[PDB]
Structures are given as C-alpha cells and as structure tokens.
Amino acid sequence: WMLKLIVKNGYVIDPSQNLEGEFDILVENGKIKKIDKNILVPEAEIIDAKGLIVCPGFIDIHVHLRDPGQTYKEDIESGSRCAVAGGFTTIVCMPNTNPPIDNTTVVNYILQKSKSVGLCRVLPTGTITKGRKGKEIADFYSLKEAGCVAFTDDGSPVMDSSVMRKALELASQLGVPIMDHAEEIQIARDGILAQRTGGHVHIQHVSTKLSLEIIEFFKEKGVKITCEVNPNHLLDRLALIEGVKRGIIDCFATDHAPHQTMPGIIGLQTALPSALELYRKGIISLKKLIEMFTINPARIIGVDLGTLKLGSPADITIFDPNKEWILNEETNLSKSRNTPLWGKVLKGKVIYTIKDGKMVYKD
C-alpha cells in the first residue's frame, strides 16, 4: 500500500477553477490534497511530469462498447483499455446494445462488468423507448435510479415529436439530458422542444453550417442545448472547424464505433492527437481543448468530474502534446481497427492516466 502520490514538474491546466501553471499535485488516499508550486512529502510515490500537461481525466460521452451483443467487435474490457490509453477516466456507453439498455438487468450487467475490469468508470445511458422501437417511453426513473446518466434511442433518431416531447419532460424532471441524432429540421425541433419543456438536449451530430447557426441561436436564447464533434473526423468539415473556433461546439466526443467489415470509426485512442492538430493549427487554445475533454462533458451529463478541485477523486490525465506515435498492431487496444488513422503518424500521446489515484495506464 502506498498512500500518497506527487505529480511533479508538470504544467497543470484545470479550467473549471481557472487554474493553470507549473504546479505539483499531491494526491492522498485517492483524492486531490494540494496543488502548489513545489511539493515534497515523505513516503510518496513521485511521477515526474516535466514537459507534460497535467489535467483532469478526460470524459468521453459517446462510446459504443458493443457489449452486450457484438462482443467480437469490442467489449467493456477492450473499450476500457482503449479509453485509458486515450486519457479517458470516464466513458458513457450508448444504449444500442443487444439487448438494448432499456431495463435494469442490462444496466447492472454493464456496471458489474465495468467494476470487474477496473480501469475507467463506465456510465450507462438508457433508451428513450422500449426496445428502441420508438413507440412506448422507457421507465426513465428506474433506469436513472439504476445508474443511467442520459437517454437516447441512438442508432435511430426519435421520429415522433410527441415521443421526443414526453422524453424531454421526463428528463427535465430527473435532471438528465436527452441525446439525439433532415438534420437541420431535427435540431430545430429539439431546440424548440427543449425550450418549451425546460429539458436539456445534446446534439450528437452536426455536419452543416446551418445546423451550427441554429444551435448557436438556441444557446443565445438560453435554451439548454449542447453539441459535440468528433476530433478524429475533423482530420462540412470547414464549417465544423469554424464552429469549434467560435465556441458553438461544447465538447469533443469520439463516437467510438467499432466495426469489422458513416462510416463509424474507432476513436478513443486517437481523440487527443486529433484534437491537438486543431491546437497546432491555431483553431483552439490548449485551455479550450482541455475544457472540451473535461469540464464541458462533465457538465453536459451532470457529474462532479472533470476538475482537479481539492477533495475530488484523483482522476488525472498526463500527456505529451509533442510525442509522435503510430496507431498500429503495437499500440491498438481495440478489438477492431476501423479508422483512417491506422498506420499514420500522430502527434500527442497520453503518458499516464490516473483514476482514483491509481495509475491505470502508462505509456
């Protein structure tokens, strides 16, 4: 047993606290104890983070773990390993498993599997409708009480506006978001219903300038609408890039989508170097990049993660923004390989991931 850990010599960035600079972090018994220039205490393990960025552990709010149902493509274990290698300490799994996440048995399965794997926290979402069939609303209260943090029929958009409106009403009562998603009309419908219900809607896919302008319209009017983009897809790509620059897009989300034969691509391990390309091209600041992986996704799902506040669980990611590497058979932790980044030089690499004060990944 080791009780204390010092992360020394790193560049700490914690946007939730407007904190940034060359600081050490003292972790004691799994929680953040002190952040200061220079810390040294006896009987501590020391990580030397010189030349690295130290930030809250990343949160990935759109992952397909294919478990249950298609576990030859990915499973909770392999997806969890991809996630911590990518710097993520918390991942949110989508409910289009087989069977789908529409009852408490499936929720329990995912939570028990995740506890047995012991790498990142896996938060389940539930379906909006029973069987994702689009007709009959699921039991949100029971699903939420079992652990679901959001609801979506992901895979297939909810088509009936009356179903979406009911879901947003129930969601508003429970304080959780609905995740959704011809594109432009659906986003407008969701914003309008979010405004009328007081519900929070998260838009999972935006591909056009008009879509971004509509979202920004709703955000300016104070509607609880947020959206995401997959950094791996950024390299209407140019319109998306402007949306990121202007702050319309709240968060990066991988949409890790394992396949073995739009197209969905795997993404957990490459999210960071992809995002860092936007930083190197001057599209976003480093602080904004970290926000979009930490505090912003944390706020979208309403969890007290994505910070380095004192007393918080010590979920910490430590990365080298300039380290070149390649996603290939030597580094891939997924059961699938479906990404146009396969075999290409990436720049930016997680070096350590720490969850509850324990090193769960090391480069």
Catalytic residue set: 255
Nearest to 227 by CA among 211, 209, 210: 211
Which residues are CB-neighbours of 6 under 8 A, at least 6 positions away? 24, 25, 26, 27, 39, 40, 41, 44, 45, 46, 47
For residue 255, say whether it is annotated as part of any ligand binding site: yes
Q: How many residues of this chain bind Zn ion (CB under 5 A)?
A: 2
Structure tokens of 239? 């319109």
Residue 337 is assigned to a ligand binding site: no
Site for Zn ion in 224-283 (CB under 5 A): none
Instruction: Give the residue nearest to Zn ion (CB).
Output: 154
Stretch that binds Zn ion, among 45-53, 89-97, 98-106, 221-229 (CB under 5 A): 89-97
65 is in an annotated binding site: yes
**154 is a site residue for Zn ion (CB under 5 A):** yes
Q: Does 153 bind Zn ion (CB under 5 A)?
A: no
Is 9 marked within a binding site?
Answer: no
Q: Of 102 and 154, which CB lies nearer to Zn ion in the complex structure?
A: 154
Residue 65 near residue 37 (C-beta atoms within 8 A)? no
Q: Which residues pair with 228 in a beta bridge?
A: 251
How far is it, in rounded angstroms, from Cα 206 to Cα 270? 20
Say how many CA atoms lie within 13 Å of 50 toward its Cβ.
3
The verdict on 60 binding Zn ion (CB under 5 A) reads no
Which CB sits closer to Zn ion, 30 or 68? 68
**Closer residue to Zn ion in complex, CB, 54/265:** 265
Cα 4 to its chain centre, rounded Å, is 28
**DSSP-derived pairing of the beta strands 121-124 and 44-48:** unpaired
Task: Quickly tell me which residue has 């939730």 as its tokens.
Answer: 16
Find the shortest distance in angstroms from Cβ 240 to Zn ion: 17
154 has binding-site annotation: yes
Q: 94 or 138: whose CB is closer to Zn ion?
A: 94
* Paired strand residues for 14: 19
Residues marked as binding? 62, 64-66, 96, 154, 255, 259, 263-264
- Which residues are near Zn ion by CB under 5 A? 94, 154
